[PDB]
Write an enzyme that holds these catalytic residues in place. Structure first.
Site, PDB file in Angstrom:
ATOM      1  N   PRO A 164      41.407  41.935  22.410  1.00  0.00           N
ATOM      2  CA  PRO A 164      41.526  41.130  23.106  1.00  0.00           C
ATOM      3  C   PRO A 164      41.351  40.062  21.543  1.00  0.00           C
ATOM      4  O   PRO A 164      40.448  40.357  20.813  1.00  0.00           O
ATOM      5  CB  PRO A 164      39.793  40.340  23.807  1.00  0.00           C
ATOM      6  CG  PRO A 164      39.650  42.381  24.635  1.00  0.00           C
ATOM      7  CD  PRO A 164      39.900  43.114  22.965  1.00  0.00           C
ATOM      8  N   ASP A 165      41.721  38.824  21.319  1.00  0.00           N
ATOM      9  CA  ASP A 165      41.343  37.677  20.494  1.00  0.00           C
ATOM     10  C   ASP A 165      39.225  37.274  20.702  1.00  0.00           C
ATOM     11  O   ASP A 165      39.700  36.917  21.712  1.00  0.00           O
ATOM     12  CB  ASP A 165      42.386  36.370  20.407  1.00  0.00           C
ATOM     13  CG  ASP A 165      42.377  35.527  19.427  1.00  0.00           C
ATOM     14  OD1 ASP A 165      41.227  35.456  18.462  1.00  0.00           O
ATOM     15  OD2 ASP A 165      42.645  34.254  19.291  1.00  0.00           O
ATOM     16  N   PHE A 166      38.800  37.821  19.955  1.00  0.00           N
ATOM     17  CA  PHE A 166      37.654  36.988  19.802  1.00  0.00           C
ATOM     18  C   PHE A 166      37.014  35.663  19.237  1.00  0.00           C
ATOM     19  O   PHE A 166      36.170  35.089  19.840  1.00  0.00           O
ATOM     20  CB  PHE A 166      36.396  37.944  19.537  1.00  0.00           C
ATOM     21  CG  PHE A 166      36.290  39.646  20.179  1.00  0.00           C
ATOM     22  CD1 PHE A 166      35.731  39.514  21.733  1.00  0.00           C
ATOM     23  CD2 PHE A 166      36.849  40.267  20.241  1.00  0.00           C
ATOM     24  CE1 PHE A 166      35.893  40.621  22.936  1.00  0.00           C
ATOM     25  CE2 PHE A 166      37.255  41.284  20.598  1.00  0.00           C
ATOM     26  CZ  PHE A 166      36.511  41.523  22.469  1.00  0.00           C
ATOM     27  N   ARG A 167      38.187  35.370  18.129  1.00  0.00           N
ATOM     28  CA  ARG A 167      37.997  34.003  17.598  1.00  0.00           C
ATOM     29  C   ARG A 167      37.987  32.872  18.684  1.00  0.00           C
ATOM     30  O   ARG A 167      38.074  31.965  18.450  1.00  0.00           O
ATOM     31  CB  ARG A 167      38.692  33.931  16.801  1.00  0.00           C
ATOM     32  CG  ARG A 167      38.033  34.614  15.087  1.00  0.00           C
ATOM     33  CD  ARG A 167      38.517  33.322  14.445  1.00  0.00           C
ATOM     34  NE  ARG A 167      37.644  34.455  13.149  1.00  0.00           N
ATOM     35  CZ  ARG A 167      36.768  33.602  11.974  1.00  0.00           C
ATOM     36  NH1 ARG A 167      36.222  33.039  12.355  1.00  0.00           N
ATOM     37  NH2 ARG A 167      36.318  34.031  10.729  1.00  0.00           N
ATOM     38  N   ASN A 226      41.788  40.418  11.069  1.00  0.00           N
ATOM     39  CA  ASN A 226      41.706  41.144  12.025  1.00  0.00           C
ATOM     40  C   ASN A 226      40.303  42.278  11.359  1.00  0.00           C
ATOM     41  O   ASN A 226      40.933  43.432  10.277  1.00  0.00           O
ATOM     42  CB  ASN A 226      43.081  42.296  12.314  1.00  0.00           C
ATOM     43  CG  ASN A 226      43.504  40.741  13.722  1.00  0.00           C
ATOM     44  OD1 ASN A 226      43.430  39.584  13.408  1.00  0.00           O
ATOM     45  ND2 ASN A 226      44.871  41.520  14.128  1.00  0.00           N
ATOM     46  N   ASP A 278      39.725  45.355  13.588  1.00  0.00           N
ATOM     47  CA  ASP A 278      40.371  46.435  14.372  1.00  0.00           C
ATOM     48  C   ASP A 278      40.735  47.088  14.110  1.00  0.00           C
ATOM     49  O   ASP A 278      40.931  48.566  14.485  1.00  0.00           O
ATOM     50  CB  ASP A 278      40.988  45.532  15.243  1.00  0.00           C
ATOM     51  CG  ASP A 278      42.955  44.690  15.487  1.00  0.00           C
ATOM     52  OD1 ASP A 278      42.813  45.921  14.495  1.00  0.00           O
ATOM     53  OD2 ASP A 278      42.889  44.642  15.450  1.00  0.00           O
ATOM     54  N   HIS A 317      38.416  39.149   6.928  1.00  0.00           N
ATOM     55  CA  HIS A 317      37.285  39.066   7.664  1.00  0.00           C
ATOM     56  C   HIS A 317      36.636  40.426   7.338  1.00  0.00           C
ATOM     57  O   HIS A 317      35.340  40.383   7.752  1.00  0.00           O
ATOM     58  CB  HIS A 317      37.514  38.510   8.561  1.00  0.00           C
ATOM     59  CG  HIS A 317      38.041  37.324   8.226  1.00  0.00           C
ATOM     60  ND1 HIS A 317      38.417  36.803  10.023  1.00  0.00           N
ATOM     61  CD2 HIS A 317      38.608  36.258   7.777  1.00  0.00           C
ATOM     62  CE1 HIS A 317      39.017  35.916   9.823  1.00  0.00           C
ATOM     63  NE2 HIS A 317      38.599  35.252   8.512  1.00  0.00           N
TER      64      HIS A 317
END
Ligand SMILES: Cn1nc(C(F)(F)F)cc1-c1ccccc1CO
Ligand SMILES: [Cl-]
Ligand SMILES: [Zn+2]
Length: 288
Positions: A39-42, A107, A109, A126
């Site tokens: 999932p996109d957490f930002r 990302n 991930d 990041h």
């Protein structure tokens, strides 16, 4: 006048296969990993520890004083599988075809590395969960993701085997600087880029967004994204897709996987991409 003969995906494909286009920079965000189950957490729309301010769970000082909340959250959020998407393997194909200058990713991930981009190919703006380091400046022992996973699932706070300091995933926390590699690479790569491929990012987080203004004025910029993004903010070198002055920016609106499939089809790469994805996915599914 312009490098693209038309402001369409077809125009971008024709440019990519022309001798004018030799060096591609990809800028990618959470949109290229949502179809992998990450999932996109930002995104505030997705997702007890008594934090003085909630961002303390990602602030380096609080982590160093109280790391247990972070590792409990990391256990909760740990993916069930690390399977990169069609988009990730499209970038691997770019690499294989000798077109990839650099992939800049927001990302953490690790899916770019799993898909076969090397450290030299990547600017993880990041950070990444792929490696972790002892936080003591005089030690900095590096640990791989499997070690960190064992620690996280056993609910043992990870400590360095050499000095017993905390071990932290190599993601950029609040209060930490962006990696110097981000600025070092930007200063060199954007002198060299022939095409900017912007996939799965809304270009809202800085300084990652400002990257698009570092391209030469002639460099075409293709956005593959669910929504148009990167245009100048009416309130505050932005993307110009739709004005009469538009000359180099193209928006393909949809899921990143389907956009990469459409582009690969135009390029004659669809069979190669399908074969690569099917074999890599099979290998991941078969991990015993
Ligand atoms: C386990 N973990 N923990 C966090 C944090 F705690 F920082 F938020 C982020 C992740 C993570 C790691 C690899 C891939 C994907 C994710 C998130 O979906
Ligand atoms: Cl964004
Ligand atoms: Zn150490």
């Amino acid at each position: 006048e312009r490098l693209l003969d038309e402001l369409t995906l077809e125009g971008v494909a024709r440019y990519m296969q022309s001798e004018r286009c030799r060096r591609v920079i990809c800028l990618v965000g959470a949109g290229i990993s949502t179809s992998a189950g990450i999932p996109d957490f930002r995104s505030p729309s997705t997702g007890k520890y008594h934090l003085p301010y909630p961002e303390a769970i990602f602030e380096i000082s609080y982590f160093k004083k109280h790391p247990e909340p972070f590792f409990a959250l990391a256990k909760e959020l740990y993916p069930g599988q690390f399977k990169p998407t069609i988009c990730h393997y499209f970038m691997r194909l770019l690499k294989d075809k000798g077109l990839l200058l650099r992939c800049y990713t927001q990302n953490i991930d690790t899916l770019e590395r799993i898909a076969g981009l090397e450290q030299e190919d990547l600017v993880e703006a990041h950070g990444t969960f792929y490696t972790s380091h002892c936080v003591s400046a005089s030690c900095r022992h590096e640990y791989p993701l499997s070690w960190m996973k064992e620690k996280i699932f056993s609910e043992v706070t990870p400590k360095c085997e050499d000095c017993q300091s905390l071990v932290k995933p190599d993601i950029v926390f609040f209060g930490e600087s962006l990696p110097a590699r981000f600025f070092s690479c930007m200063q060199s790569d954007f002198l060299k880029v022939d095409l900017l491929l912007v996939m799965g990012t809304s270009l809202q987080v800085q300084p990652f967004a400002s990257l698009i203004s570092k391209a030469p004025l002639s460099t075409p910029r293709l956005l593959i994204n669910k929504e148009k993004a990167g245009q100048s903010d009416p309130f505050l070198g932005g993307m110009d897709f739709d004005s009469k002055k538009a000359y180099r920016d193209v928006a393909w609106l949809g899921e990143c996987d389907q956009g990469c499939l459409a582009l690969a089809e135009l390029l004659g790469w669809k069979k190669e991409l399908e074969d690569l994805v099917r074999r890599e996915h099979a290998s991941i599914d078969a991990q015993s």
